């Protein structure tokens with residue numbers, strides 16, 4: 399199990415100022431629903447996956463200090479008709495991975511059997527739902543396959559999570575800096591776990 403290397407102490411050391419809404423046990427419990435997460439490939443692939451998942455979360459949530467996107471648009475894409483926006487509701491970033499947009503809340507809600515399209519706030523109000531949405535995005539959108547492949551691709555996870563705004567950005571631009579911060583956190587977490595991060599890091 400991945401909890402053998404990401405212990406409560408490792409987690410607390412990485413997120414010392416986390417909002418109390420986010421707990422280690424919450425992540426563990428939610429991960430039980432995605433048995434392949436952190437158990438795919440070699441032990442080093444397992445370590446890289448946890449470092450990549452939590453490194454991306456470190457960037458998105460500000461070290462788990464934030465539950466909701468700070469100073470957000472309502473993120474309702476009217477061209478995305480499969481998952482209809484609910485009147486007055488907003489799909490700004492929520493949870494560890496800052497799940498955004500009606501299309502992600504809708505697909506996640508469908509896969510998780512949750513009322514996320516009509517009640518997106520559940521992601522910021524129920525920590526079990528919050529962790530499940532982060533793991534759901536990671537698995538369903540295939541950040542999992544990107545990082546656990548041989549060779550591993552941390553860059554692939556960034557592309558999938560927020561590539562339009564963070565990848566292929568001029569060096570030093572805000573998007574490029576966010577991208578580099580994800581790489582910095584991933585490599586720092588890999589150092590804690592004693593694993594090589596791989597060479598495919600930036601996008």
Ligand SMILES: CC(=O)N[C@@H]1[C@@H](O)[C@H](O[C@@H]2O[C@H](CO)[C@@H](O[C@@H]3O[C@H](CO)[C@@H](O[C@@H]4O[C@H](CO)[C@@H](O)[C@H](O)[C@H]4NC(C)=O)[C@H](O)[C@H]3NC(C)=O)[C@H](O)[C@H]2NC(C)=O)[C@@H](CO)O[C@H]1O
Pocket residue numbers: 457458459460464465466467468469491495496497498499502535558559560562563572575576577579
């Ligand atoms: C320089 C630096 O690193 N500053 C930090 C701030 O960046 C950080 O605030 C957080 O910033 C991130 C951007 O890195 C922002 O991210 C949002 O995240 C969601 C989810 O990844 C993105 O949604 C994706 O949208 C695309 C379409 O554009 C979809 O294709 C994709 O499916 C979506 N992904 C998911 C998982 O839903 C948003 O696009 C993205 N927003 C932007 C404009 O980039 C977070 O919301 C910010 N977090 C907070 C809490 O506001 C800040 C955190 O405290 O720390 C700074 O240091």
